[PDB]
């Protein structure tokens, strides 16, 4: 029912990519304090140190933070997802590995529940169709967004993290056309991702049917105050946690 505001932290070798400004645990705690509802960590650590680095991150976050958090970035199998949830993550995000093996969604859900499984979907307009992209936007899968959304729910996912490659990195607004396209295809909670620049963008995403709105730099560089944002959304009829 209540719409969620979510902070994304991109991390590598235990540092926040761009007390300690770049300590993911400290920045995470700062966000829970100012009224962020959940965190998403996305790790780009080198294969050799990656497994250990992500387990150390989850351990250190789980004891210092009280709000729900998701971890992801290169989770390729059940064993990896399992060790991260058991070490303290509430949820894992899978994307490339989900597209390549949709049964991985069901495998994680069978042990940890559908609510522990976030499928991150990166989509872009190609020749007038919404297409699914894998490998951090490098590969057009040729799979229609319409088909993948329905399959992800069928396989037992709990939530969709929907990133518009067309808006990600810009401050031009969330892709409300893409959110409105996905909304009638699924009963799952949708996290809107990519394009947040100002408070009005959050209102537009919730009108489009997003259950949550994710951003990074607008919070990180304090272009948007989280308390001001929540006060703004409540003023215009959005059900937010205050
Ligand atoms: Ni990535």
Curated annotation (Swiss-Prot):
It comes from the Bacteria. Changing residue 122 to A/C/F/G/H/I/K/L/M/N/P/Q/R/S/T/V/W/Y: Complete loss of activity. InterPro entries: Aldolase_TIM, His_biosynth, HisF, IGPS_HisA/HisF, RibuloseP-bd_barrel. Its EC number is 4.3.2.10. It is found in: Cytoplasm. The keyword Cytoplasm applies. Pathway: Amino-acid biosynthesis; L-histidine biosynthesis; L-histidine from 5-phospho-alpha-D-ribose 1-diphosphate: step 5/9. It catalyses: 5-[(5-phospho-1-deoxy-D-ribulos-1-ylimino)methylamino]-1-(5-phospho-beta-D-ribosyl)imidazole-4-carboxamide + L-glutamine = D-erythro-1-(imidazol-4-yl)glycerol 3-phosphate + 5-amino-1-(5-phospho-beta-D-ribosyl)imidazole-4-carboxamide + L-glutamate + H(+). Pfam families: His_biosynth. One of its GO terms (cellular component) is cytoplasm. The active site is at residues 10, 122. Its main location: cytoplasm. GO terms for molecular function: imidazoleglycerol-phosphate synthase activity; lyase activity. One of its GO terms (biological process) is L-histidine biosynthetic process. Belongs to the HisA/HisF family. IGPS catalyzes the conversion of PRFAR and glutamine to IGP, AICAR and glutamate. The HisF subunit catalyzes the cyclization activity that produces IGP and AICAR from PRFAR using the ammonia provided by the HisH subunit. This is Imidazole glycerol phosphate synthase subunit HisF. It comes from Thermotoga maritima (strain ATCC 43589 / DSM 3109 / JCM 10099 / NBRC 100826 / MSB8).
